[PDB]
Design a protein around this ligand. Sequence first.
Ligand SMILES: Nc1ncnc2c1ncn2[C@@H]1O[C@H](COP(=O)(O)OP(=O)(O)O)[C@@H](O)[C@H]1O
Ligand SMILES: [Mg+2]
Length: 265
Amino acid sequence: DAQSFLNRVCGVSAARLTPCGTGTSTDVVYRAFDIYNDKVAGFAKFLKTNCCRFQEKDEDDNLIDSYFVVKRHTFSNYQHEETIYNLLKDCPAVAKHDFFKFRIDGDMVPHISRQRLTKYTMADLVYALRHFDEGNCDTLKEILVTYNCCDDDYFNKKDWYDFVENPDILRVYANLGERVRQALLKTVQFCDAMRNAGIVGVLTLDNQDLNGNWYDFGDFIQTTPGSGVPVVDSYYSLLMPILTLTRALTAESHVDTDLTKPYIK
Ligand SMILES: Nc1ncnc2c1ncn2[C@@H]1O[C@H](COP(=O)(O)OP(=O)(O)O)[C@@H](O)[C@H]1O
Ligand SMILES: [Mg+2]
């Protein structure tokens, strides 16, 4: 049933979930992976299929930007991800997981659930700002709207995207800046939580939702604690043109790095 499954996914975290999928079946969505393995490589828009997605709604039944991705995979990967998460649990930049085994049809399929991710990961912001195409920019309108950079009528302007006819677009993009900068800070906590726990892995962009949290421990192998390494070659590098389109460091010219406080003199 898709109702006992929902009442399991809600868990102990008192959240009210509307299934974006349909009937305990995975929701196939078109996303922006950054991937390298023995067959494929690149920063490309693939199509992910292994994740049931439920959206949480607040009081008065309004949908907020907070989802519950419930990725289902093999039992061995579930066990490995459970031990890696129980090492990295104490970190604050790690989205809260929930590991359960549920009767899907006649068998216990192991689901690992991730709580309160946003809709689009950082790779979707970076891909939609790096691979711009003004006919088809719908994961940039939705990111700009849903994080209050503009107000969904800004796109009724004739050329809202144009840096030379509409220079005000820079003020729009800079309103993403503090959402990006906090993301950077959360990475440096997560990298630290890897280094002090002895976990070796590759930080990709698409494993970080736009709040900042990190949520994929599939190919992290653990070594002796105090000596793990994070590999952030292709995290910081793909992200790099976004750190000045969106002016991510203009909260650093303010005293004690708070956007409310006055400038440093
Ligand atoms: N064929 C598959 N079906 C489902 N899950 C898989 C498959 N191959 C790998 N995985 C697991 O999913 C991860 C990649 O899934 P992905 O689509 O990136 O979702 P997420 O970003 O949540 O990991 C890998 O780390 C691995 O643990
Ligand atoms: Mg992943």
